[PDB]
């Protein structure tokens, strides 16, 4: 296969530290993960990520009021604004201090951000999509005011409806108005008086009343009324109520300016929206346990958008329905592990947290999380069916759910008790075996029976890795007595044959025509080993390749950092011709298991914030007493209970104080897709899904001179050879003429075509109709292509069965959507129809 | 070490799968998925000697048969059947 | 200074310690040549790494092997095992990483036990 | 101009021109230091290094020819109208053009200085002084010298103001002659004549710290200092040789620095511009000399092709530190200790480029997917036998790739005083580079010093070794670099042939440097042990492959199975890589002669340049040509591919550079430059081509257009059951949406008051929500039942959302008893008129799933529906019997045929 | 001594199963005794086995 690997969508985390935002239209949710933002579309369900990566976490997301022009902030104040419709990075600068604060004007020409002290009034840069005869310019931004006429945070910035003023939220207790330019009838004034500063000023709709909303829970009207002595009037205060939140401080208020309600998010979880010039408590309800950090509105007013930093928690809250748009929560601890579904459309994660969770690739929320886990949940695994789920915890038992009944049907221990940490399971689904880490034992239970068949025993360690073979007859456990063991149980006699390595076994994995397997070592080597005669037949010494290192908390340089140099998990291809392989390191190696050559090695995170993300830390940071990232800064804090450190000395896995300040970069699973095209893997800042690019790359297959897109079309529309067409697309290589020529040739010459078509290009026909079927509204059109090619080809697909593997897989999926999604209605439809015909 | 396996038990409606699912736009399953009704058919009604009626009885297939209309044979055969399996426990 | 590697060579109760350092071209075993020392049909085990490695290797080291312990027959399987891993740990430390991976390639598509010695454990059928 | 590539800046440049600098104070801390690019000005600061601040848009139109930096503001003065170009004076400010001078109509000459005092700027041209007002921006008058012969009118030297002396410019002839103008009322007021009149022409002029002295520099080599009320000579030197005039003086207003002991004040430094070193006086007895500072840039020479001088000599105000500038492309700051003595000083800060044109030019490959990515990093290899690292990102960071301790070497030489040059104490001039940093170990690839070019692996396989590979010019080793120490690598490998090397290139997996000499020769060295491993070829038939000519253009598959390798003369062969035998060769022979060749690696295609001006594309999987592009008028320079393989640019002698689509097989676009280019290269993402020209020193980066806007641009130039596109999820909701929303209903309720608000504010669009697309369902279903065509209220009904969906489809109804007045026959027969029509399935069969569901009982108490109803069943039946006989069979045989063993 | 013994696991040669820790804090209960060890490149390993005369360099 090609391995021209770029990056698609991030997954499996929906938030994390930053701002919130919608789309001008309503539907697209923008939200920042880490160092990239996600846009979730919702109404279709869909799921994006832009290109761009940011060094460190995001700070800050404004949008222009047109919709085109994102500018993302990340901490530090380095900024990329980037092209919405079209997902490309545009402009990098960096505001030399960390924002604080950031809002565009609705007008679009300026966008005002404060940085701790300052305010600064920029200039929207003119960009090479709004202007036809345009192109990049050097320094693109130009300032238009600074004000400094401030004492300390500015926590929020609101510009004015007619966008000639602005309101700046302080953290000195005073909001102040500005103007854009100098106005008749205007002094810059201040609006004092509060008790512990104030989180938001908000514009009314006629710009007369402003308010202001507090951290103590009390938000105030501003009116321009005469003083009470009445040319002579001043900015003062006609009315004060507040939110009477019991014990906690408001995080994070927004305000409605069209529809006049104000909804504001508190430290205790529970946020309240008001009805606010008369202050009548429309409604007010828990979202979450721990606090709210930001809110925002939409611009048609009938969705709220909550973030809450500490887990994950996004949820988009529809008021006046009073339900969910959506809920969804990343992890908020280790991702242990990860299978993607045999059909190949979500993915499943296991982290530390206690619950698994069932990720779509598209659409990118989690769709069920199963919490029956009391402790950290490692290895989950799937059968060959699809539908049922194996995994393993912490807390001795190997659960198995049913995924279309989403219950837990069987749960497994041992008699005396374990803490499993690694599993496999027969393909057929009926036996399960587990490994862990306090007995050397091996146990395999029966899924239909439920009780322990055995407990295999050989290892003089604890087994680290264990594998079923794809076709159903070996068993491979790979341990820390510096062994192997091929495992044959499901034969009359039951053996088991040793393979002695050099180091402890970190991972096992088969190749899917399963004569091979790979077994990944603690030295840092994979050796490639074959099953049936018990020999080693390839190995890749791979320290050098994976060794990215020096984290903080490290006194080697990265190149003597050990630890950092071998493979935790290694997956064959779908194909069987790649590993891909990652450990505890910053990079994935994809290695050849013929050529025995690194093909392509990747960098999973840019992520500053993160701790191993760079082989050379900068003396800059180095103070005299230790890193400048080490220094516990909690008492700065100005809440308790982010001053309160409930951290436990020496616990490396899991506690819930969980200090987790500058976490360290691992790859604890990685997965390749069974439609092919994709893998992805499971790092600390996400679930990275990284794809093949055939669309943005010319890539001919085996190309003469006299071939070009006008030939092809010339061929077509002059002379109709479809089959001559049809082979000059496929060799030619570009998905829009071959699918225009696709849809060219007609219903009838489909069988002609297909009959005079070649066997060297049969599977990429089959992988482009099944590609077809699941995305082109010509559904009748290839399934008579799909027919016909499997009424030709028959005995040539069955004959060879591993070659075209995937393509079968990705064929078959397309035809169980068309099966699953119209049919079924068609069948349904017709005998309701019959019935009341019938009376 | 983990902890002792204490009983717990987990209460299941009759509702389907999407009211199992987290809170989203739109489901994920198609629309055949969504009326799998989260309780099998055995949980829904399962016959048994409990749930007869009071001259027929069930047999080991889930069949309703009387004792009125069946004959001596099958009666002897019954009580063996019932006292063969007194025996093994 | 000095370039030396000093690798373990193992089998039943014969082990071999084989010092291996800048040289002209010489093997010695026992204070003895490598030529001599073994029954007059094993030395076709002695001389099976040279053989697959070529002698262009092992132009520019000096080996020197002590055994001890074993039968004929063990104490030439860990000759051959330290002659091996000698010169594959040479060309790990003093040449290129490739030539060391080439050199680990050759020898373990002929035979894995020129590489590491596999113990026969007691596990019959249980 | 072009339709793809739109110039950004022109990078590696900091001083080329011999247009001075300027300094202005900024406070009490910083210098901002303001030099000419030749069509825009650079602004570094101080002390933050001396790294770029502002640069200067947008791109005057002709070449800067003054400046001056004013509060905030620079000024900036260009064109010389004498030849062509459109002249005038700009006000920048934070690098954006915030004023324009009006210059005066009759101005045909071009501006030398400009000078900003009082409220008045003043711009001494050629023989003519024009002076604005400053406030305003306005024109005051224009001051005329005038002279008996034609030569000594010309304002050479310039025109500076004395500190305290009101509204009086000094101006320096061609004559000896110092005259004293008074700028408000035009009027000539003083003329001062030179001492022993055989020095003949100002060369400059510069106010002393002391009240009411100038410092007059002339021709025949005299300094005097002067009073200019008194007209009395303080101080006369003889600071020049005839030959060498004094060009630029600057005093020190720090307060010491003289007098052998370092606490007396009056140091002056010096500078000519034929020489490369500054002088420094102690003018406190006689005024003695107190040390030059040789070789402080380049001395120039009109035989060799690196350019040199000092343009500019400043000492900063009352600090130690002096900023000089010269024309070799560098700036240098020099500062003098206190507590040792120092009659010369030592350097601090020093910026440089390339001191000579840009040879060849290299985008650096990817760290892997990191924060450097393709696009951070150039590699230009100079004229001036010099490789410099550049970094488009910040160009602070940006540093030469050292050889070794060459101004060491130069200064334990007799290079810096006075034989070769400090060039010449370098390797050649590069010819080519290629890279890898796959083993790149950063900055500790190699711990400890290494030998440089020699012509232990534990530790070089633990952290890293060479990382790029370079064949200079006339020599027969091919150099070797780290990159990451930015240093000289340790080995220079020889080519086997003895000839000089034609072509470099290093594996993919950053192991193996393949060199190929002029002769024909082609060696494999090991990088990491820096020994041969594989000559090609070794010792069709085995053994005998070899070129019969130059070696232009080897390169390596990534998977190191195959090399394959261009000669000059003819053919392209093919070799097995662990072997060293020639595989498979290719022969244009008689009829071409390969000059280059380029590789796109994930695309497995090379480019051939040969000398018949044309490019021939070839697989190297199936070994035939597929692409020849005939365009070029000139032999081709430099040419080079995109990262998606889409086009290839070639530029050509003829200075048009061409760009060829690769799949259309056609040109795109062929844009003329104003020198011919000698080196492209393009980032290895598609953003960056980087143009190195001929006669410019620095590089030329343009954009990528058609990444940010899409470009029309293919012109070819010379000079059936269907589903419907509705999303998925809304119809899938549609037909789900009760469970849908009892999910998304939270477990506990929200806690509403007792006295709850009734009549909520208004959200959404008038009422209702803002997905409802804005202009009554019913009227439209009966007007599309009254005509014909029910595709109205079908394109509607598509385009709702779930909610309201269901809402319109729950609220028709029967009414008042008649077959034209009732929805739902109606909306039985626009499903009966789809199902004929063959355009919506899924949606009409969700549709109507969700009618029967919500309406059954209507439909079976009345008949007058049961007959279209019935319509329906016929047209239901037979689509879906075809339909599910069909995808039914490619379900059952593609599940046998994954598995048709049990 | 525990003041060497905190300097060695501060440089990072000891590790605890399969993952090397820097932390001089972690709790290693009882069964994890059994399992403490140096790294795999380690210079103190190198010392032991220098000492014992088993220093195999492959």
């Not at chain 1, 930053?18 to 279709?44: A, I, K, M, Q, Y």
């Not at chain 4, 002029?205 to 520099?217: D, G």
Request: overall charge neutral.
């Amino acid at each position: 296969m090609k391995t021209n690997f770029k990056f698609s969508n991030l997954l499996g985390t929906v938030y994390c530290r930053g701002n919130l935002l919608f789309s001008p239209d309503g539907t697209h949710l923008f939200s920042p993960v880490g160092n990239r933002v996600t846009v979730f579309n919702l109404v279709e369900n869909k799921s994006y990520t832009f290109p761009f990566a940011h060094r460190k976490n995001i700070s800050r997301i404004g949008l222009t009021p047109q919709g085109n022009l994102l500018l993302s902030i990340d901490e530090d104040g380095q900024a990329i604004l980037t092209n919405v419709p079209r997902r490309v990075v545009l402009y990098h600068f960096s505001f030399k201090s960390p924002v604080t604060a950031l809002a565009f004007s609705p007008s679009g020409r300026h966008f005002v951000v404060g940085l701790k002290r300052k305010i600064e009034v920029w200039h929207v840069p003119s960009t090479p999509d709004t202007n036809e005869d345009g192109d990049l310019e050097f320094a693109p931004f130009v300032r238009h005011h600074t004000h400094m006429q401030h004492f300390d945070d500015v926590r929020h910035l609101e510009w004015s409806s007619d966008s000639r003023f602005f309101l700046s939220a302080s953290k000195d207790l005073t909001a102040r108005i500005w103007s854009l330019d100098t106005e008749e009838g205007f002094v810059p004034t201040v609006l004092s008086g509060h008790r512990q500063g104030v989180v938001g000023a908000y514009f009314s709709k006629d710009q007369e009343t402003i308010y202001t909303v507090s951290k103590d829970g009390a938000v105030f009207e501003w009116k321009y009324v005469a003083k009470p002595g009445h040319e002579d009037m001043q900015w003062r205060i006609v009315n004060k109520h507040f939110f009477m939140q019991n014990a906690a401080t408001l995080r994070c208020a927004a305000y409605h300016a069209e529809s006049n309600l104000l909804v504001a998010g508190f430290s205790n979880g529970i946020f309240g929206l008001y009805e606010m010039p008369d202050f009548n408590l429309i409604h007010t309800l828990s979202i979450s346990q721990n606090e709210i950090d930001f809110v925002t509105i939409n611009k048609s007013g009938e969705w709220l958008a909550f973030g809450a930093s500490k887990l994950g928690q996004l949820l988009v809250w529809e008021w006046q329905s009073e339900s969910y748009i959506l809920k969804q929560q990343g992890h908020f601890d280790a991702m242990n592990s990860l299978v993607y579904s045999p059909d190949g459309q979500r993915i499943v994660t296991a982290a530390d947290d206690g619950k698994i969770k069932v990720w779509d690739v598209e659409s990118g929320f989690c769709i069920v999380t199963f919490t029956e886990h009391t402790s950290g949940v490692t290895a989950c695994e799937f059968a060959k069916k699809g539908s049922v789920l194996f995994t393993a915890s912490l807390d001795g038992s190997v659960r198995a759910w049913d995924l279309i009944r989403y219950r837990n049907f069987r749960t497994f221990t041992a008699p005396e008790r374990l803490s499993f940490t690694c599993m496999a399971v027969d393909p057929s689904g009926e036996v399960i075996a587990a490994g862990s880490i306090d007995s050397f034992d091996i146990h395999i239970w029966s899924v239909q029976t439920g009780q322990l068949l055995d407990r295999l025993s050989g290892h003089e360690g604890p087994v680290s890795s264990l594998a079923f073979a794809p076709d159903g007859s070996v068993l491979v456990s790979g341990s820390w007595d510096r062994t192997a063991r091929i495992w044959s149980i499901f034969s009359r006699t039951q053996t088991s044959e040793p393979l002695q390595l050099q180091s402890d076994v970190l991972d096992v994995a088969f190749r899917p025509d399963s004569k091979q397997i790979a077994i990944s070592t603690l030295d840092g080597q994979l050796t490639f080993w074959s099953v049936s005669e018990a020999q080693q037949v390839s190995g890749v010494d791979g320290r050098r390749d994976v060794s990215g290192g020096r984290r903080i908390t490290d006194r080697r340089t990265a190149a003597n950092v050990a630890g950092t140099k071998n493979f935790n998990t290694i997956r064959y291809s779908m194909d069987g011709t790649c590993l891909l392989a990652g450990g505890n390191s910053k990079y994935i190696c994809l290695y050849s298991t013929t050529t025995m050559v690194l093909l392509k090695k990747f960098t999973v995170s840019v992520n500053l914030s993160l701790s191993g993300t760079q082989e050379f830390l900068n003396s800059k940071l180095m103070t005299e007493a230790g890193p400048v990232g080490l220094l516990d800064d909690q008492g700065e804090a100005s809440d308790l209970e982010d001053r309160i450190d409930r951290s436990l000395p020496g616990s490396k896995r899991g506690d819930p104080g969980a200090r987790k300040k500058f976490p360290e970069v691992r790859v604890s699973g990685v997965a390749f897709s069974p439609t092919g095209n994709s893998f992805c893997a499971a790092s600390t800042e996400g679930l990275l899904v990284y794809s093949l690019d055939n669309t943005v790359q010319f890539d001919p297959f085996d190309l003469n001179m006299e071939i070009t897109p006008a030939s092809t079309l010339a061929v077509l529309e002059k002379e109709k050879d479809y089959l001559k067409a049809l082979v000059m697309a496929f060799r030619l290589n570009e998905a829009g003429l071959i699918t225009r020529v696709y849809q060219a040739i007609p219903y009838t010459d489909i069988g002609l075509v297909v009959e005079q078509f070649p066997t060297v290009y049969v599977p990429r026909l089959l992988r482009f109709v099944a590609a077809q079927t699941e995305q082109s509204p010509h559904m009748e059109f290839c399934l008579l292509w799909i027919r016909a090619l499997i009424d030709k080809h028959g005995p040539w697909l069955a004959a060879n069965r591993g070659k075209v593997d995937v393509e079968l897989r990705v064929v078959a999926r397309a035809v169980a959507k068309m099966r699953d999604e119209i049919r079924r209605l068609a069948d349904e439809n017709v005998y309701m129809v019959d019935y009341l015909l019938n009376q | 070490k983990p902890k002792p396996p204490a009983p717990t038990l987990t209460v299941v409606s009759d509702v389907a799968t999407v009211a199992m699912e987290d809170a989203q736009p739109a489901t994920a399953q198609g629309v055949a998925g969504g009326e799998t009704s989260m309780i099998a058919p055995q949980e829904v009604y399962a016959p048994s000697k409990d749930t007869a009626e009071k001259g027929e009885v069930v047999t080991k297939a889930g069949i309703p048969i009387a004792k009125q209309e069946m004959s001596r044979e099958e009666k002897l055969r019954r009580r063996r059947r019932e006292k063969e399996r007194i025996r093994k426990a | 200074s000095v370039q030396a590697v000093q690798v373990f060579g193992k089998k039943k109760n014969a082990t071999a310690v084989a010092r291996c350092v800048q040289g002209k071209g010489l093997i010695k075993v026992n204070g003895k040549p490598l030529k001599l020392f073994a029954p007059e049909i094993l030395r076709a085990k002695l001389y099976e790494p040279i053989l697959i490695l070529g002698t262009d290797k092992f132009a520019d080291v000096d080996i020197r092997i002590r055994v001890a312990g074993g039968g004929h027959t063990s104490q030439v399987y860990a000759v051959r095992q330290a002659i091996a891993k000698s010169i594959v740990a040479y060309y790990a430390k003093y040449v290129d990483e490739h030539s060391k991976n080439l050199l680990k390639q050759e020898l373990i598509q002929f035979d894995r036990s020129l590489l590491v010695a596999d113990p026969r454990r007691c596990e019959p059928k249980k | 101009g072009s339709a793809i590539f739109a110039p950004y800046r022109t990078i590696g440049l900091i001083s080329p021109t011999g247009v001075p600098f300027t300094s202005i104070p900024l406070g009490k801390t910083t210098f901002q230091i303001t030099t000419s690019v030749g069509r825009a000005l650079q602004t570094y600061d101080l002390k933050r290094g001396l790294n770029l601040v502002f640069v200067t848009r947008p791109q005057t139109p002709s070449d800067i020819t003054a400046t001056h930096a004013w509060k905030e503001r620079v000024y900036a003065a260009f064109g010389d109208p004498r030849n062509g170009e459109p002249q005038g004076l700009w006000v920048f400010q934070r690098g954006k053009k915030v004023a324009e001078l009006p210059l005066p109509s009759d101005l045909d000459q071009p501006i030398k200085q400009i000078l900003i005092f009082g409220g008045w700027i003043v711009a001494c041209a050629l023989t003519r002084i024009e002076v604005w007002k400053a406030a305003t921006l306005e024109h005051y008058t224009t001051i005329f010298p005038a002279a008996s012969k034609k030569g000594d009118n010309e304002l050479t030297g310039g025109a500076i103001n004395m500190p305290t002396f009101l509204n009086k410019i000094f101006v320096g002839r061609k004559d000896g002659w110092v005259e004293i103008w008074n700028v408000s009322t035009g009027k000539l007021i003083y003329t001062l004549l030179p001492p022993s009149p055989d020095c003949g022409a100002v060369t400059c002029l510069q106010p002393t710290p002391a009240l009411s002295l100038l410092a007059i520099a002339y021709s025949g080599g005299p300094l005097v200092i002067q009073n200019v009320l008194t007209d009395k000579t303080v101080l006369l030197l003889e600071a020049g040789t005839d030959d060498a005039p004094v060009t630029s003086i600057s005093f020190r207003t720090d307060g010491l620095g003289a007098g052998q002991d370092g606490r007396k004040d009056g140091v002056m430094a010096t500078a000519t511009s034929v020489s490369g070193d500054v002088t420094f006086w102690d003018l406190n007895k006689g005024g003695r000399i107190m040390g030059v500072l040789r070789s402080a840039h380049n001395p120039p020479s009109r035989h060799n092709i690196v350019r040199g001088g000092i343009s500019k000599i400043e000492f900063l105000a009352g600090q130690p530190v002096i900023v000089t500038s010269g024309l070799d492309n560098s700036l240098k700051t020099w500062i003098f200790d206190e507590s040792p003595f120092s009659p010369v000083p030592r350097i601090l800060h020093q910026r440089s480029g390339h001191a000579a044109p840009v040879r060849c030019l290299h985008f650096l490959p990817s760290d892997f997917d990191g924060a450097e990515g393709g696009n951070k990093w150039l590699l230009s290899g100079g004229k001036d036998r010099s490789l410099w690292g550049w970094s488009l990102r910040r160009d602070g960071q940006s540093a030469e790739l050292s050889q070794g301790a060459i101004r060491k070497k130069a200064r334990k030489m007799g290079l810096l005083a006075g034989t070769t040059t400090l060039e010449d104490l370098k390797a050649p001039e590069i010819t080519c580079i290629a890279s890898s940093l796959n083993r790149d170990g950063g900055m500790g690839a190699i711990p400890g010093k290494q030998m440089i070019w020699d012509k232990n692996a534990e530790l070089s396989g633990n952290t890293g070794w060479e990382s790029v590979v370079t064949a200079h010019k006339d020599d027969p080793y091919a150099r070797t670099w780290f990159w990451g120490r930015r240093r000289a690598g340790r080995w220079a490998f020889k080519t086997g042939d003895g000839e000089p090397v034609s072509t470099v290139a290093i594996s993919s997996c950053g192991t193996f440097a393949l060199v190929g000499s002029t002769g024909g020769s082609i060696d494999m060295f090991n990088l990491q042990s820096g020994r041969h491993r594989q000559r090609f070829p070794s010792r069709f038939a085995p053994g005998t492959g070899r070129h019969t000519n130059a070696v232009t253009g080897i390169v390596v598959d990534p998977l190191n199975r195959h090399v394959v390798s261009c000669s000059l003369d003819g053919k392209v062969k093919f070799w097995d890589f662990i072997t060293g035998n020639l595989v498979d060769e290719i022969d244009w022979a008689p009829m071409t002669k390969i000059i280059g060749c380029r590789y796109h690696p994930g695309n497995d295609l090379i480019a051939f340049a040969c000398d018949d001006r044309s490019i021939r594309v070839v697989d190297i999987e199936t070994k035939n040509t597929i692409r020849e592009f005939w365009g070029c008028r000139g032999d081709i320079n430099d040419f080079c591919f995109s990262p998606d393989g889409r086009w290839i640019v070639a530029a050509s002698q003829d200075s048009i550079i061409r760009v060829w689509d690769l799949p259309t097989a056609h040109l795109i676009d062929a844009f003329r430059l104003e020198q011919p280019c000698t080196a492209l290269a393009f980032s290895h993402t598609g953003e960056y081509l980087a143009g190195a020209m001929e006669g410019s020193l620095g590089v030329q980066i343009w954009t990528n257009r058609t990444l940010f806007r899409h470009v029309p641009t293919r012109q070819i130039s010379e000079s059936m059951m269907t589903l419907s596109l509705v999303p998925r999820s809304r119809w899938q909701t549609l037909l789900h949406i009760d469970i849908i929303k009892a999910r998304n209903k939270p477990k506990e309720p929200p806690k509403a008051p007792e006295k709850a608000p009734f009549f909520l504010p208004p959200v959404g669009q008038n009422g209702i929500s803002s997905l409802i697309p804005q202009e009554t369902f019913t009227s439209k279903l009966l007007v599309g039942g009254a005509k014909g065509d029910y595709t109205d209220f079908i394109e509607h009904l598509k385009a709702l959302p779930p909610a309201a969906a269901d809402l319109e489809l729950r609220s028709l109804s029967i009414g008042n008893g008649d077959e034209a007045t009732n929805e739902l026959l109606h909306f039985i027969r626009a499903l009966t008129s789809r199902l004929v029509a063959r355009r919506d399935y899924e949606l009409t069969q969700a549709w109507m799933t969700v009618f029967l569901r919500l309406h059954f009982d209507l439909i079976m108490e009345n008949e007058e529906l049961l007959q279209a109803l019935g319509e329906w069943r016929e047209h239901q039946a037979r689509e879906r019997d075809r339909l599910s006989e069909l995808v039914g069979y490619c379900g059952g045989v593609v599940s046998f045929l994954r598995s048709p063993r049990t | 001594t525990v003041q060497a013994a905190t300097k060695l696991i501060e440089q990072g040669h000891v590790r605890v199963g399969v993952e090397e820790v820097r932390d001089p804090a972690f709790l290693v209960t009882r069964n994890m005794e059994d399992f403490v060890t140096w790294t795999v490149g380690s210079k103190i390993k190198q010392n032991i086995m220098k000492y014992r005369d088993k220093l195999d360099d492959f």
